[PDB]
Amino acid sequence: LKKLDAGKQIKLETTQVSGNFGTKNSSGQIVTEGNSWSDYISQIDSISASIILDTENESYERRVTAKNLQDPEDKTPELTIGEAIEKAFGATKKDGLLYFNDI
Amino acid sequence: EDLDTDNDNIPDSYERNGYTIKDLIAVKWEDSFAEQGYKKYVSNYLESNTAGDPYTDYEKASGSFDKAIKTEARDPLVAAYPIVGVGMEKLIISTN
Amino acid sequence: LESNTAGDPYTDYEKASGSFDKAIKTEARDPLVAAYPIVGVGMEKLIISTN
Ligand SMILES: [Ca+2]
């Protein structure tokens, strides 16, 4: 409790976030149960980069597939950083500069 | 000499002599192939999964599984395997 | 271009046809008026004690 008075900050670390997504069943019925995100989480983080936006009222984080030039059998497209950003946040090119809405 | 016994989608002469994966089909091994960056795979044509893990020799070389798998485990002889121990960081002793 | 235009589990046909759970309010038969239960919990009695 004395480490708070010196002004050190309490961190709220939150690990694994088990949950579900919604698929379209063969009867037009959206189902949530059995569709564990944590199944695909391990995959995506492996082949991707992590992109975050500050936007000082609310933050946005995205994941985008990378190429890994050292594999010939990965026929995934290749992206420069600036190219990734505009697709990861729906950004626009007003003048070649990238704009979020007007930022 | 172009027939698959273990049905792993890899003909026996390929598995026995040498093969890599191109466009997700099994083609035979050439030494000029290593230039672009392919790897030389060779496995047991008498076993669905040569390494013994739940993934077949095809799947391993193809890379068509859980992509978080370390790349060396794509070799049908390097078994995909999670090795987990529990380490300790803080040691607190008390009398309460 | 959509199985269920409104987004609810019922298809645009089913909505207009009225061939579903008949307790659905009739305006929700319009494939644009989403069938939707909106439930809050109200309070009637407020008792405060020290026990
Ligand atoms: Ca085999």
Ligand SMILES: [Ca+2]
């Ligand atoms: Ca075989």
